[PDB]
Amino acid sequence: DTKEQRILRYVQQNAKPGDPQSVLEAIDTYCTQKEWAMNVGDAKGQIMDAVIREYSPSLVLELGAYCGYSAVRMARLLQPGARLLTMEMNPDYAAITQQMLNFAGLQDKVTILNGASQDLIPQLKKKYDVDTLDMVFLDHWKDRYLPDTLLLEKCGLLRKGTVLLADNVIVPGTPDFLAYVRGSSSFECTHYSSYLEYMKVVDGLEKAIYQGP
Ligand SMILES: CCNc1ncnc2c1ncn2[C@@H]1O[C@H](/C=C/CNC(=O)c2cc(-c3ccc(F)cc3)cc(O)c2O)[C@@H](O)[C@H]1O
Ligand SMILES: [Cl-]
Ligand SMILES: [Mg+2]
Ligand code: NA
Numbered sequence: 427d428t429k430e431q432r433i434l435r436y437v438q439q440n441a442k443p444g445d446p447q448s449v450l451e452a453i454d455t456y457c458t459q460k461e462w463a464m465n466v467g468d469a470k471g472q473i474m475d476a477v478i479r480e481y482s483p484s485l486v487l488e489l490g491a492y493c494g495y496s497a498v499r500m501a502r503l504l505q506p507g508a509r510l511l512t513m514e515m516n517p518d519y520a521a522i523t524q525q526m527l528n529f530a531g532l533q534d535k536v537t538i539l540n541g542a543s544q545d546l547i548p549q550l551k552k553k554y555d556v557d558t559l560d561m562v563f564l565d566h567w568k569d570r571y572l573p574d575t576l577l578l579e580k581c582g583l584l585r586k587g588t589v590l591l592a593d594n595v596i597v598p599g600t601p602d603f604l605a606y607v608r609g610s611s612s613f614e615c616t617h618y619s620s621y622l623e624y625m626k627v628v629d630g631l632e633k634a635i636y637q638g639p
Contacts, residue, residue, distance in 0.1 A: 428518070429461050429463060430463070430492075430493050430518070430519060430522045431522070432456075432460075432461065433453060433456055433457070433461075433463060433493050433522075434493065434522050434525055434526060434529075436452055436453075436455075436456040436460075437449050437452045437453060437456075437526065437529060438529055440452040440455070440456075441529070441530075443529055443530075443531065444530065444531035445530070445531075446498050446499075446501070446502035446530045446531070446532060447502070449498050449526065449529060449530045450468070450471070450495070450498060450499060450502075453465060453493070453495055454467065454468050454624070457623070457624050458624050462623075462624055462625070463492075463493065463623075464492060464623065465492065465493065465495035465496070465623050466495060466496050466499070466565065466593055466623060467495075467621075467622070467623025467624055468623075469620045469621040469623070470593065470618075470620045470621070470623065470629065470630075470631055471495075471496075471499055473618045473620055473631055474496065474499060474500065474563075474591065474631070475499065475503060477589065477591055477633060478500055478503045478504075478561075479503060481560065481561060481589055482505055482508075483504075483508065483560035483561040483589065484505070484507070484508045484509070484560050485508070485509055485511075485556065485558075485559055485560050485561075486500055486504070486508075486509070486510045486511070486559070486560060486561045486562070486563065487510075487511050487512075487513070487550075487559050487561070487562045487563070487583075488500070488510060488511070488512040488513065488562075488563045488565065489513050489543050489562070489563065489564050489565060489566040489570075489574060490513070490514065490543075490564070490565040490566025490567070491512040491513065491514035491519065491520065491523040491538065492514070492519055492522075492523070492565075493519065493522050493523060493526060494512075494522065494523035494524075494526035494527055495526075496563060496565060497510060497512045497523060497526070497527060497532075497536055498526060498527065498530050498532060500563065501527070501530075501532045501535045501536050502530070502532065504535055508535065509535055509536070509537065510535060510536045510537070511536075511537050511539060511550075511554065511556075512536060512537070512538055512539065513538075513539045513541060513542075513543045513546050513566075514538060514539070514540060514541075515540070515541060515542045515543075517540055520538050520540040523538055524538055537554075539554075543566060543570065543574050543577075544570075544573070544574065544577060547574065547577050547578060547581060547583070548577070548581055550581070550583060551581070551582070551583070556583065558582070558583055558584065558585040558588065559578070559583050559584065559585075559588055560588060560589070561588065561589040561590075561591065562578065562588065562589070562590045562591070563591050563592075563593070564590065564591070564592040564593065564600075564603075565592075565593040565594070568594060568598050568599065568600040568603075569600075569602070571592055571600045571602075571603035572600070572602045572603040572606055575590065575603065575606075575607070575634075579612075579636075579639070584636040585636065585638075586636065586637060586638045587635060587636070588635070588636040589633060589634075589635055589636075590607070590613070590632075590633070590634040590635070590636065591631055591632075591633055592604075592631060592632045592633075592634065593629075593631060594629060595617070595629070595630050595631065595632045596619075596628055596629045596630045597622050597627055597628070597629045603632075604632060607632065607634040611637065612636060612637050612638070612639065613634040613635065613636060613637065614634070614635045614637060615632060615633065615634045615635075616632070616633045617630055617631075617632055617633075618630055618631040618632075618633065
């Protein structure tokens with residue numbers, strides 16, 4: 427098997443079906459005690475939770491599901507009727523994520539879109555009946571944060587107040603994205619210093635609130 431399969435099996439055997447918090451705890455324990463994996467983790471996850479609670483978004487887009495950690499983390503805090511769309515290009519990881527969400531009992535709140543964001547983003551309005559997004563969590567390949575932010579804007583998916591929340595702005599880093607949003611009048615930015623998942627290494631989240639064109 428793969429590391430991702432081992433994480434899923436650990437959750438299934440060490441969390442309670444339908445209990446998202448127990449699922450997060452199991453992933454975090456496994457990744458701390460057994461094998462590191464690129465989940466946002468609990469340190470930055472607490473910041474994510476605070477942001478989700480503040481904004482209570484009705485429609486969230488996640489770029490880069492991986493094993494479904496952040497999809498579980500966010501969806502557990504969504505209000506009734508709210509939804510999360512999460513894009514994942516790797517079929518094996520998309521299957522992990524779906525099974526993770528199913529175990530957590532969150533499958534009715536989340537849609538997996540098994541594809542690349544640059545192909546799927548232009549289909550959101552006509553195929554996924556999206557008007558505009560309330561929040562976007564960026565956690566895919568770091569050199570795609572800027573291209574996909576510009577594409578979301580082009581496609582009319584951003585509105586005044588849409589919250590972009592970007593992982594890994596320190597490690598591995600996303601220098602072009604960060605310089606761009608911080609320098610642009612179209613985004614009001616805040617930096618949340620934290621730690622790399624499971625490691626005593628500084629990382630951070632960037633919140634960039636879209637202000638209109
Ligand atoms: C092609 C762009 N569009 C995409 N659309 C949909 N899914 C995509 C896309 N890119 C990547 N994916 C998926 O997102 C995930 C990839 C995320 C990339 N993340 C990282 O590189 C990352 C890396 C680290 C890290 C930090 C320190 C290290 F020493 C080593 C690694 C930490 C993190 O928190 C990370 O998020 C995978 O599941 C992948 O298949
Ligand atoms: Cl952590
Ligand atoms: Mg990350
Ligand atoms: Na700015």
